[PDB]
Amino acid sequence: QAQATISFPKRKLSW
DNA sequence: GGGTTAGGGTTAGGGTTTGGG
């Protein structure tokens, strides 16, 4: 639950 | 525009992972 984010790989994220 | 992932797009919710705000 505390790790639901993650921030999927190169996908719009942190250009 | 901008923020975890962070930009765009219009739209306020959506959308690669995604909800607002």
Short mmCIF file of N, CA, C and O (backbone and C1' of nucleotides) in Angstrom, two decimals:
data_model
loop_
_atom_site.label_atom_id
_atom_site.label_comp_id
_atom_site.label_asym_id
_atom_site.label_seq_id
_atom_site.Cartn_x
_atom_site.Cartn_y
_atom_site.Cartn_z
N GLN A 1 0.86 -1.22 0.00
CA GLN A 1 0.00 0.00 0.00
C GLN A 1 0.88 1.24 0.00
O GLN A 1 0.63 2.20 -0.74
N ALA A 2 1.92 1.23 0.84
CA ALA A 2 2.83 2.36 0.92
C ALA A 2 3.75 2.41 -0.29
O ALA A 2 4.55 3.32 -0.44
N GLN A 3 3.61 1.41 -1.16
CA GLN A 3 4.44 1.34 -2.37
C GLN A 3 3.57 1.15 -3.60
O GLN A 3 3.94 0.44 -4.53
N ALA A 4 2.40 1.80 -3.61
CA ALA A 4 1.49 1.69 -4.74
C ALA A 4 1.92 2.63 -5.86
O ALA A 4 1.69 2.35 -7.04
N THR A 5 2.55 3.74 -5.49
CA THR A 5 3.01 4.71 -6.48
C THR A 5 4.04 4.09 -7.41
O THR A 5 3.72 3.66 -8.51
N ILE A 6 5.29 4.05 -6.95
CA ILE A 6 6.37 3.47 -7.75
C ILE A 6 6.84 4.45 -8.82
O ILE A 6 8.03 4.74 -8.94
N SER A 7 5.90 4.92 -9.62
CA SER A 7 6.21 5.85 -10.71
C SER A 7 6.67 5.06 -11.94
O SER A 7 7.83 5.11 -12.33
N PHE A 8 5.73 4.30 -12.53
CA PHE A 8 6.04 3.48 -13.70
C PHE A 8 7.21 4.06 -14.49
O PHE A 8 7.37 5.28 -14.58
N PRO A 9 8.01 3.20 -15.04
CA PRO A 9 9.21 3.58 -15.84
C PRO A 9 8.97 4.77 -16.76
O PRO A 9 7.95 5.45 -16.67
N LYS A 10 9.93 5.03 -17.65
CA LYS A 10 9.83 6.15 -18.58
C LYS A 10 8.46 6.19 -19.24
O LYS A 10 8.27 5.65 -20.33
N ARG A 11 7.52 6.84 -18.57
CA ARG A 11 6.17 6.97 -19.10
C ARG A 11 5.61 8.33 -18.71
O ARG A 11 4.81 8.44 -17.78
N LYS A 12 6.06 9.37 -19.41
CA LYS A 12 5.62 10.73 -19.11
C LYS A 12 6.31 11.21 -17.84
O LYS A 12 6.62 12.40 -17.69
N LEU A 13 6.54 10.28 -16.92
CA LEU A 13 7.19 10.58 -15.65
C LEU A 13 8.54 11.26 -15.85
O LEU A 13 9.21 11.04 -16.86
N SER A 14 8.92 12.07 -14.87
CA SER A 14 10.19 12.76 -14.91
C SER A 14 10.76 12.78 -16.33
O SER A 14 11.78 12.16 -16.60
N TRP A 15 10.07 13.48 -17.22
CA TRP A 15 10.49 13.57 -18.61
C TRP A 15 11.93 13.08 -18.77
O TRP A 15 12.11 11.90 -18.98
"O5'" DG B 1 1.76 24.23 -19.24
"C5'" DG B 1 1.46 25.56 -18.80
"C4'" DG B 1 2.02 25.83 -17.42
"C3'" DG B 1 3.19 24.94 -17.02
"O3'" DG B 1 4.11 25.67 -16.20
"C1'" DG B 1 1.40 24.56 -15.54
P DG B 2 5.37 24.91 -15.54
"O5'" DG B 2 4.72 24.01 -14.39
"C5'" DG B 2 4.09 24.61 -13.26
"C4'" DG B 2 3.65 23.54 -12.29
"C3'" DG B 2 4.54 22.31 -12.24
"O3'" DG B 2 5.61 22.50 -11.31
"C1'" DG B 2 2.21 21.72 -12.13
P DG B 3 6.59 21.27 -10.95
"O5'" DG B 3 5.65 20.27 -10.14
"C5'" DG B 3 5.17 20.62 -8.84
"C4'" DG B 3 4.84 19.37 -8.06
"C3'" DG B 3 5.49 18.09 -8.58
"O3'" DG B 3 6.78 17.88 -8.00
"C1'" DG B 3 3.18 17.72 -8.29
P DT B 4 7.32 16.38 -7.79
"O5'" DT B 4 6.91 15.63 -9.14
"C5'" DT B 4 6.40 14.29 -9.12
"C4'" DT B 4 6.96 13.52 -7.94
"C3'" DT B 4 7.07 12.00 -8.12
"O3'" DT B 4 8.27 11.52 -7.52
"C1'" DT B 4 5.40 12.54 -6.46
P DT B 5 8.76 10.02 -7.80
"O5'" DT B 5 9.25 10.05 -9.32
"C5'" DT B 5 8.45 9.50 -10.37
"C4'" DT B 5 8.41 10.45 -11.54
"C3'" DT B 5 8.12 11.89 -11.18
"O3'" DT B 5 8.78 12.77 -12.10
"C1'" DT B 5 6.33 11.08 -12.47
P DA B 6 9.82 13.85 -11.55
"O5'" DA B 6 8.88 14.99 -10.95
"C5'" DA B 6 8.15 15.86 -11.82
"C4'" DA B 6 7.70 15.12 -13.05
"C3'" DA B 6 6.95 15.98 -14.06
"O3'" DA B 6 7.87 16.54 -15.00
"C1'" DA B 6 5.79 13.92 -13.68
P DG B 7 8.11 18.12 -15.05
"O5'" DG B 7 7.69 18.54 -16.53
"C5'" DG B 7 6.33 18.81 -16.85
"C4'" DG B 7 6.04 18.41 -18.28
"C3'" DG B 7 4.76 18.98 -18.86
"O3'" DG B 7 4.99 20.27 -19.44
"C1'" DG B 7 4.83 16.66 -19.28
P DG B 8 3.79 21.00 -20.22
"O5'" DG B 8 3.09 19.83 -21.05
"C5'" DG B 8 3.57 19.48 -22.34
"C4'" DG B 8 2.54 18.66 -23.08
"C3'" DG B 8 1.21 19.35 -23.33
"O3'" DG B 8 1.28 20.17 -24.50
"C1'" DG B 8 0.87 17.07 -22.71
P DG B 9 -0.07 20.75 -25.16
"O5'" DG B 9 -1.15 19.61 -24.90
"C5'" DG B 9 -1.53 18.70 -25.93
"C4'" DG B 9 -2.71 17.87 -25.48
"C3'" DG B 9 -4.07 18.56 -25.64
"O3'" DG B 9 -5.06 17.63 -26.08
"C1'" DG B 9 -3.78 17.94 -23.41
P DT B 10 -6.56 18.14 -26.36
"O5'" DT B 10 -7.14 18.50 -24.92
"C5'" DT B 10 -7.58 19.83 -24.62
"C4'" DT B 10 -8.73 19.80 -23.64
"C3'" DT B 10 -9.80 20.86 -23.90
"O3'" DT B 10 -11.08 20.42 -23.44
"C1'" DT B 10 -8.72 21.34 -21.85
P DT B 11 -12.38 21.31 -23.73
"O5'" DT B 11 -12.62 22.09 -22.36
"C5'" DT B 11 -11.98 21.69 -21.16
"C4'" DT B 11 -12.04 20.18 -21.02
"C3'" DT B 11 -12.23 19.68 -19.59
"O3'" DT B 11 -13.61 19.36 -19.36
"C1'" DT B 11 -10.27 18.70 -20.52
P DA B 12 -14.25 19.59 -17.91
"O5'" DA B 12 -13.16 19.01 -16.90
"C5'" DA B 12 -13.13 17.62 -16.59
"C4'" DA B 12 -13.14 17.41 -15.09
"C3'" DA B 12 -13.73 18.55 -14.28
"O3'" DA B 12 -13.95 18.12 -12.93
"C1'" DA B 12 -11.41 18.63 -14.06
P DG B 13 -14.87 16.84 -12.62
"O5'" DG B 13 -13.80 15.68 -12.30
"C5'" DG B 13 -12.67 15.49 -13.15
"C4'" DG B 13 -12.99 14.49 -14.24
"C3'" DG B 13 -12.48 13.07 -14.00
"O3'" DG B 13 -13.32 12.12 -14.65
"C1'" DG B 13 -11.29 14.04 -15.80
P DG B 14 -12.72 10.68 -15.06
"O5'" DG B 14 -11.82 10.99 -16.34
"C5'" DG B 14 -10.59 10.30 -16.55
"C4'" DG B 14 -10.16 10.40 -17.99
"C3'" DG B 14 -9.14 9.36 -18.44
"O3'" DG B 14 -9.26 9.11 -19.84
"C1'" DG B 14 -8.11 11.50 -18.37
P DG B 15 -8.36 7.97 -20.52
"O5'" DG B 15 -6.88 8.56 -20.49
"C5'" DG B 15 -6.05 8.54 -21.66
"C4'" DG B 15 -4.60 8.45 -21.26
"C3'" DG B 15 -4.23 7.19 -20.44
"O3'" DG B 15 -2.91 6.73 -20.79
"C1'" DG B 15 -3.60 9.08 -19.27
P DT B 16 -2.67 5.20 -21.25
"O5'" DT B 16 -1.12 4.92 -20.94
"C5'" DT B 16 -0.66 3.65 -20.48
"C4'" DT B 16 0.85 3.64 -20.34
"C3'" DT B 16 1.39 3.52 -18.90
"O3'" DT B 16 2.03 2.25 -18.73
"C1'" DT B 16 1.82 5.66 -19.76
P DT B 17 1.20 1.04 -18.07
"O5'" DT B 17 0.70 1.64 -16.68
"C5'" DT B 17 1.61 2.30 -15.81
"C4'" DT B 17 0.93 2.69 -14.52
"C3'" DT B 17 -0.23 3.68 -14.68
"O3'" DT B 17 -1.33 3.29 -13.84
"C1'" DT B 17 1.33 4.55 -13.16
P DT B 18 -2.83 3.76 -14.18
"O5'" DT B 18 -2.88 5.26 -13.67
"C5'" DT B 18 -2.37 5.60 -12.38
"C4'" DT B 18 -3.38 6.43 -11.60
"C3'" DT B 18 -4.63 6.84 -12.40
"O3'" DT B 18 -5.81 6.45 -11.69
"C1'" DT B 18 -3.12 8.69 -12.09
P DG B 19 -7.16 7.31 -11.87
"O5'" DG B 19 -7.06 8.41 -10.72
"C5'" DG B 19 -7.67 8.20 -9.45
"C4'" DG B 19 -7.62 9.46 -8.63
"C3'" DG B 19 -8.50 10.60 -9.14
"O3'" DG B 19 -9.75 10.61 -8.45
"C1'" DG B 19 -6.33 11.38 -8.39
P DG B 20 -10.64 11.95 -8.44
"O5'" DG B 20 -9.82 12.95 -9.37
"C5'" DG B 20 -9.90 14.37 -9.18
"C4'" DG B 20 -9.12 14.77 -7.95
"C3'" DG B 20 -9.47 16.16 -7.42
"O3'" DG B 20 -9.27 16.22 -6.00
"C1'" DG B 20 -7.23 16.16 -8.11
P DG B 21 -9.67 17.55 -5.19
"O5'" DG B 21 -8.71 18.68 -5.79
"C5'" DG B 21 -7.30 18.61 -5.60
"C4'" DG B 21 -6.67 19.96 -5.86
"C3'" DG B 21 -7.66 21.12 -5.97
"O3'" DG B 21 -7.10 22.31 -5.42
"C1'" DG B 21 -6.50 20.88 -8.02
#
